[PDB]
Amino acid sequence: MITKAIYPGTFDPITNGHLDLVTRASAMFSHVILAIADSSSKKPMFTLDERVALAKKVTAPLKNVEVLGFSELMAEFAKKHNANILVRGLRSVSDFEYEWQLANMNRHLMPKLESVFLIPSEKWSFISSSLVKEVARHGGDITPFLPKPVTKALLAKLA
Amino acid sequence: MITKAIYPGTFDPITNGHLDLVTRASAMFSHVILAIADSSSKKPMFTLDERVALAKKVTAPLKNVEVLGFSELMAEFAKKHNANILVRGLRSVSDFEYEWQLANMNRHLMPKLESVFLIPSEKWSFISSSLVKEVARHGGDITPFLPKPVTKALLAKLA
Amino acid sequence: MITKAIYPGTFDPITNGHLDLVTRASAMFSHVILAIADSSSKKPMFTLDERVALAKKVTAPLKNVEVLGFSELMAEFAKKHNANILVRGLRSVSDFEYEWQLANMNRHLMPKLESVFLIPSEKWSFISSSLVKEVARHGGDITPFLPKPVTKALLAKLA
Amino acid sequence: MITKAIYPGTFDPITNGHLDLVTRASAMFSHVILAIADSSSKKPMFTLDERVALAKKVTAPLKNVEVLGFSELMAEFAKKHNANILVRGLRSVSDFEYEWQLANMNRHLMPKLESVFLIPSEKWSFISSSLVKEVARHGGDITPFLPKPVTKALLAKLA
Amino acid sequence: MITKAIYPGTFDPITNGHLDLVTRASAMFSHVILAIADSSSKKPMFTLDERVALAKKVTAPLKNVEVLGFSELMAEFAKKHNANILVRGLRSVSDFEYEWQLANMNRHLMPKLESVFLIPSEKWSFISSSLVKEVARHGGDITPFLPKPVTKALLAKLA
Amino acid sequence: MITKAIYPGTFDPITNGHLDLVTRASAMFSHVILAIADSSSKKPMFTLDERVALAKKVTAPLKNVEVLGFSELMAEFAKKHNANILVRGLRSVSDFEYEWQLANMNRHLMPKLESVFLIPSEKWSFISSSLVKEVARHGGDITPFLPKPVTKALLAKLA
Ligand SMILES: CC(C)(COP(=O)(O)OP(=O)(O)OC[C@H]1O[C@@H](n2cnc3c(N)ncnc32)[C@H](O)[C@@H]1OP(=O)(O)O)[C@@H](O)C(=O)NCCC(=O)NCCS
Ligand SMILES: CC(C)(COP(=O)(O)OP(=O)(O)OC[C@H]1O[C@@H](n2cnc3c(N)ncnc32)[C@H](O)[C@@H]1OP(=O)(O)O)[C@@H](O)C(=O)NCCC(=O)NCCS
Ligand SMILES: CC(C)(COP(=O)(O)OP(=O)(O)OC[C@H]1O[C@@H](n2cnc3c(N)ncnc32)[C@H](O)[C@@H]1OP(=O)(O)O)[C@@H](O)C(=O)NCCC(=O)NCCS
Ligand SMILES: CC(C)(COP(=O)(O)OP(=O)(O)OC[C@H]1O[C@@H](n2cnc3c(N)ncnc32)[C@H](O)[C@@H]1OP(=O)(O)O)[C@@H](O)C(=O)NCCC(=O)NCCS
Ligand SMILES: CC(C)(COP(=O)(O)OP(=O)(O)OC[C@H]1O[C@@H](n2cnc3c(N)ncnc32)[C@H](O)[C@@H]1OP(=O)(O)O)[C@@H](O)C(=O)NCCC(=O)NCCS
Ligand SMILES: CC(C)(COP(=O)(O)OP(=O)(O)OC[C@H]1O[C@@H](n2cnc3c(N)ncnc32)[C@H](O)[C@@H]1OP(=O)(O)O)[C@@H](O)C(=O)NCCC(=O)NCCS
């Protein structure tokens, strides 16, 4: 039996929370696409190419993980790649509303794609990317929250 | 790659919500144990044997689902059955607290068992077993909420 | 156009929160039944007759409010009284889950009965009956939380 | 006894969720104004005139519903129209905070206007307008979520 | 300036979460009473004397912490001890409702006593005493969740 | 024993909710800095100097409160001022997520700074600054929500 899962997000940038979730998804499913949405209208700090390069560095040890950027409808991209499982995180109760909305919308768009949720380790659940960037903008130490090469890119982006 | 998942609960009795979640788990994983906890101290309405018999009737069409009752530590039962994935439902934000507590406890008890969460269909998410029993006690129609043989057993239990 | 609303609860005992909600419902609808469920299996402190007598004293100034005790299915009682609107309170986010479950169940039981929700005044929203009783058991002052005759009955019940 | 209710919102555009709530309000109250706030500072996709025209098409079968655009304080508009009831939706727990804030503010602005809340059908509760627009921008099917003429206008707005 | 804080609870038994909160309160305030409510009607597993003895062992290194059992109204006990600050934990969003209710009730009972809240370390926030006892009843390892002497007493209580 | 607390925020502008929290913090701690973040990237309505002047007027009666504007990392500012306690508000469950994220981030940035939370009076808990500004923009009365001199400045800012 073969599961092809998609882990979609803007990953701007990939964090230690994302790394925990993709590592766990990697262990459970045959193949995982870490799918990075262009999200142009959402004004990312890093370009799609920069985000893809960071995610590849961070997920390199995971054999059955593939990083792909995409600009289309997520449901269309999943269909294209024959994915049948969408994996998303729930850091705390507050994440539930939007995951429920997305999962219901995706149910309409691609009835065969099942959404499943993982709760990140307690080490990473409080991590908000906006707050990490805010701390970085003020020169605060963000090394615990991001992979090494991500910390390096973020600091460079802000210097 | 082979996933053996456990879907544990008291299932007192199995509802259309449980049926939706086990059917979806059945489609995703190689094998699913629908594991019914004795839960003696939690005072179930149906005996363990009655609950196992109902769950077998309701899950009979699902080839790769096995129904087993258990009285021990859930983590010990999973280890015994070489399960590596625990599947649980999240009906709404309110279910998150207890799933987060259980998942963290289970992480300590069996570090290799991953917990994953499914959100039931909008058709069934509002279903509370206590409220279904309350309605049944007052002679109200509960046919939409439970499989046919479960409705039959519940009505008999209450007549 | 004529609205007959039902405001159902265990009212064990009626509080200043209930009084605020029934007073507001009284102002909006043609007629309001303040319907007191027997709720025998839920072990009320006050008998149904005691609860009905307290609610009558407290709602006496409200011309178009009628207090009735009932032991059947709430939906059946509403049908019996030709009620088309069920009014319930939401004190805070935490009350939402159970109101959503009840409203969906009631939708199945009586499709024509509409449930509508009021948020109690900030003066009363934090009031929990269990906590008021707990404070009363320890001789603490509960006069702000209950109508005068209710405070009198509760104190007598506990002396 | 006569209830004039106001159902205020930005309605950008009116959705099947709004239609469900206004239809239910229509059944309960003598008259309903579906009041569309200009909300200029909130940058709507559709002009006020476009939104009013869509809401009129969608609410045409409801005899006692009137659609009006307004740019002033909602409380002032309600006073102007002698409305005594404000109806708003609660899709899930997450909507509670803002409704509680608005209702308290409106209590100060117009003490006689009562706010009352309806929970939309399970068919529509997960619908977020931002997410529907996002799906539409990517060419995904949004026909289940919006009335036919709204789907038509949205698609045209985005082509 | 001198702060005498009270940290009240049933402490049945004291956990590593309680220890974290009392240690932090100890660092901030001049004196802390760790106040153990008899809570007879709430059916504790450990007697008041057993709970007091466990809390004394666990808080012994904290110079300015005093452990006292009490059976009266918490507000009366605080007044008796001239406490002006009540410290309580918030493990997650789900704890907020009851703390808000208690704090408002305590405001009425003793207007000069201020309630203040601490969030436990991420190491301990998921710990539920009921779930720890449930795991202990089934022979599971609970050593990470309770101080050593508490683990010893609990195991003995259950053997 | 000496507590130096910091109460940080954008205070754009200071509200009666902030005044309640700082007054309570003033009563509990030896010294309180009401610290106003420049928050340039968050586009405040009032300049930092305007916000500092308003906060000084409103906190003038509080002997042990000092108002200071700052543009750096909050943790760095606290270290600079030898603060050991950070005080923040929790108006309702909805505020918990962001306070938990901030508190965890601040734990990493300055391990010795303890965060503690106060719940504002029921009089002020529903107050949202964005909604007060929205009401002010439409000429509605906001006098209950802001100190007198703040109402004066806001009205002038909007005329
Ligand atoms: C991109 C897409 C997957 C959303 O992903 P995402 O959650 O926004 O991406 P990320 O996990 O990397 O995080 C994005 C932002 O929202 C936050 N976020 C993510 N999940 C969240 C949740 N469930 N609740 C609240 N915030 C959340 C992120 O943390 C980040 O905020 P931050 O910058 O402060 O960290 C989704 O919109 C998508 O499928 N895009 C393609 C177009 C499409 O198909 N749209 C319709 C899908 S139904
Ligand atoms: C049995 C066990 C899996 C819990 O399962 P469960 O969720 O209670 O079983 P069910 O899904 O059938 O429901 C049980 C009751 O709690 C409710 N419930 C289930 N999940 C819930 C959630 N996350 N939040 C709130 N309520 C929930 C159920 O609906 C039911 O209530 P109801 O009678 O009104 O319907 C768990 O305690 C267990 O693993 N037992 C074995 C012993 C053990 O190992 N304990 C330690 C595990 S960390
Ligand atoms: C009685 C009935 C209306 C529920 O009412 P109720 O909310 O329990 O009655 P009250 O408002 O007086 O409060 C009952 C208890 O639950 C609490 N409560 C009420 N609404 C709540 C909410 N939505 N969320 C959490 N707790 C709530 C009450 O405060 C009280 O607890 P307390 O003793 O600490 O104060 C309902 O079960 C009923 O319709 N009974 C008749 C039988 C029936 O038809 N059942 C099926 C209906 S779908
Ligand atoms: C317009 C007004 C009624 C708010 O209405 P509204 O809820 O924003 O309008 P809609 O229901 O059509 O939705 C507006 C946006 O916020 C969302 N929303 C609506 N209610 C919500 C809730 N309670 N919680 C979270 N989001 C909500 C909507 O879905 C929409 O977001 P989307 O574009 O992703 O769909 C209100 O601000 C108003 O009265 N305006 C007039 C000026 C005024 O009087 N202001 C002070 C009133 S106290
Ligand atoms: C005892 C008293 C302080 C409550 O304390 P407490 O929170 O129940 O005591 P603990 O922190 O040790 O925990 C008690 C139980 O409720 C849980 N709990 C504690 N705080 C909680 C919260 N805010 N939300 C949900 N559950 C909570 C505990 O974890 C424990 O459950 P568990 O056995 O699964 O672990 C309170 O009722 C009191 O002041 N008692 C004296 C009498 C009185 O004055 N009453 C009126 C006070 S307003
Ligand atoms: C400024 C800082 C303290 C945040 O404070 P703040 O909460 O935003 O300031 P205020 O209390 O005056 O309110 C700011 C806005 O967010 C809202 N808000 C405040 N606390 C909130 C909460 N916990 N949840 C949701 N919204 C909240 C405010 O009400 C206001 O919104 P409004 O304009 O509608 O009223 C924080 O970002 C900071 O420390 N800044 C300095 C830079 C830094 O060190 N960053 C990293 C800290 S971990």
PDB file of C-alpha atoms and ligand atoms in Angstrom, chain D residues 8-11 18 37 39 42 70 72-74 88 91 95 98-99 102 105-106 128-130, chain F residues 131 134-135 138, ligand 4:
ATOM      1  CA  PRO D   8     -25.214  44.223   9.073  1.00  0.00           C
ATOM      2  CA  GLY D   9     -22.052  43.247   7.305  1.00  0.00           C
ATOM      3  CA  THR D  10     -19.704  44.112   4.516  1.00  0.00           C
ATOM      4  CA  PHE D  11     -21.162  41.345   2.306  1.00  0.00           C
ATOM      5  CA  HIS D  18     -25.275  34.937   4.641  1.00  0.00           C
ATOM      6  CA  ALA D  37     -21.582  48.791   5.297  1.00  0.00           C
ATOM      7  CA  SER D  39     -16.469  49.743   4.785  1.00  0.00           C
ATOM      8  CA  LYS D  42     -11.539  47.846   4.783  1.00  0.00           C
ATOM      9  CA  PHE D  70     -24.877  52.608   4.567  1.00  0.00           C
ATOM     10  CA  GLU D  72     -22.458  55.825   8.813  1.00  0.00           C
ATOM     11  CA  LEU D  73     -22.199  54.392  12.285  1.00  0.00           C
ATOM     12  CA  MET D  74     -24.199  51.167  12.338  1.00  0.00           C
ATOM     13  CA  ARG D  88     -25.198  38.310  13.525  1.00  0.00           C
ATOM     14  CA  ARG D  91     -19.808  30.053  12.525  1.00  0.00           C
ATOM     15  CA  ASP D  95     -16.224  34.107  15.759  1.00  0.00           C
ATOM     16  CA  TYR D  98     -15.358  39.734  17.730  1.00  0.00           C
ATOM     17  CA  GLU D  99     -19.154  39.348  18.163  1.00  0.00           C
ATOM     18  CA  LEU D 102     -19.126  44.405  18.734  1.00  0.00           C
ATOM     19  CA  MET D 105     -19.689  48.404  21.870  1.00  0.00           C
ATOM     20  CA  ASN D 106     -23.227  48.497  20.311  1.00  0.00           C
ATOM     21  CA  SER D 128     -14.490  31.898   4.651  1.00  0.00           C
ATOM     22  CA  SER D 129     -14.854  34.616   2.025  1.00  0.00           C
ATOM     23  CA  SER D 130     -11.115  35.212   1.860  1.00  0.00           C
TER      24      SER D 130
ATOM     25  CA  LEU F 131     -12.938  49.005  17.227  1.00  0.00           C
ATOM     26  CA  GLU F 134     -13.492  52.656  14.060  1.00  0.00           C
ATOM     27  CA  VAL F 135     -16.318  54.034  16.211  1.00  0.00           C
ATOM     28  CA  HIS F 138     -17.691  57.472  12.477  1.00  0.00           C
TER      29      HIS F 138
HETATM   30  C1  LIG G   4     -19.461  45.972   8.955  1.00  0.00           C
HETATM   31  C2  LIG G   4     -19.607  45.474  10.392  1.00  0.00           C
HETATM   32  C3  LIG G   4     -21.063  45.077  10.670  1.00  0.00           C
HETATM   33  C4  LIG G   4     -18.748  44.227  10.499  1.00  0.00           C
HETATM   34  O1  LIG G   4     -19.333  43.315   9.613  1.00  0.00           O
HETATM   35  P1  LIG G   4     -18.465  42.126   9.011  1.00  0.00           P
HETATM   36  O2  LIG G   4     -18.626  40.988   9.966  1.00  0.00           O
HETATM   37  O3  LIG G   4     -17.040  42.653   8.913  1.00  0.00           O
HETATM   38  O4  LIG G   4     -19.087  41.811   7.544  1.00  0.00           O
HETATM   39  P2  LIG G   4     -19.196  40.321   6.914  1.00  0.00           P
HETATM   40  O5  LIG G   4     -20.094  39.397   7.753  1.00  0.00           O
HETATM   41  O6  LIG G   4     -19.812  40.355   5.527  1.00  0.00           O
HETATM   42  O7  LIG G   4     -17.602  39.895   6.936  1.00  0.00           O
HETATM   43  C5  LIG G   4     -16.476  40.834   6.973  1.00  0.00           C
HETATM   44  C6  LIG G   4     -15.104  40.141   7.155  1.00  0.00           C
HETATM   45  O8  LIG G   4     -14.780  39.735   8.506  1.00  0.00           O
HETATM   46  C7  LIG G   4     -15.181  38.374   8.689  1.00  0.00           C
HETATM   47  N1  LIG G   4     -16.012  38.155   9.892  1.00  0.00           N
HETATM   48  C8  LIG G   4     -17.347  38.494  10.066  1.00  0.00           C
HETATM   49  N2  LIG G   4     -17.711  38.207  11.352  1.00  0.00           N
HETATM   50  C9  LIG G   4     -16.613  37.687  11.980  1.00  0.00           C
HETATM   51  C10 LIG G   4     -16.395  37.249  13.281  1.00  0.00           C
HETATM   52  N3  LIG G   4     -17.316  37.485  14.211  1.00  0.00           N
HETATM   53  N4  LIG G   4     -15.148  36.767  13.660  1.00  0.00           N
HETATM   54  C11 LIG G   4     -14.096  36.734  12.747  1.00  0.00           C
HETATM   55  N5  LIG G   4     -14.303  37.185  11.457  1.00  0.00           N
HETATM   56  C12 LIG G   4     -15.535  37.656  11.081  1.00  0.00           C
HETATM   57  C13 LIG G   4     -15.988  38.073   7.421  1.00  0.00           C
HETATM   58  O9  LIG G   4     -16.198  36.721   7.092  1.00  0.00           O
HETATM   59  C14 LIG G   4     -15.204  38.838   6.391  1.00  0.00           C
HETATM   60  O10 LIG G   4     -13.935  38.203   6.230  1.00  0.00           O
HETATM   61  P3  LIG G   4     -13.703  37.429   4.833  1.00  0.00           P
HETATM   62  O11 LIG G   4     -13.563  38.543   3.826  1.00  0.00           O
HETATM   63  O12 LIG G   4     -12.558  36.451   4.913  1.00  0.00           O
HETATM   64  O13 LIG G   4     -14.996  36.650   4.613  1.00  0.00           O
HETATM   65  C15 LIG G   4     -19.199  46.488  11.455  1.00  0.00           C
HETATM   66  O14 LIG G   4     -17.804  46.762  11.509  1.00  0.00           O
HETATM   67  C16 LIG G   4     -20.044  47.734  11.356  1.00  0.00           C
HETATM   68  O15 LIG G   4     -21.167  47.862  12.196  1.00  0.00           O
HETATM   69  N6  LIG G   4     -19.673  48.677  10.473  1.00  0.00           N
HETATM   70  C17 LIG G   4     -20.229  50.022  10.447  1.00  0.00           C
HETATM   71  C18 LIG G   4     -19.379  51.010  11.266  1.00  0.00           C
HETATM   72  C19 LIG G   4     -19.592  50.778  12.760  1.00  0.00           C
HETATM   73  O16 LIG G   4     -20.708  51.043  13.231  1.00  0.00           O
HETATM   74  N7  LIG G   4     -18.579  50.322  13.518  1.00  0.00           N
HETATM   75  C20 LIG G   4     -18.709  50.042  14.945  1.00  0.00           C
HETATM   76  C21 LIG G   4     -19.667  48.891  15.249  1.00  0.00           C
HETATM   77  S1  LIG G   4     -19.507  48.363  16.976  1.00  0.00           S
END
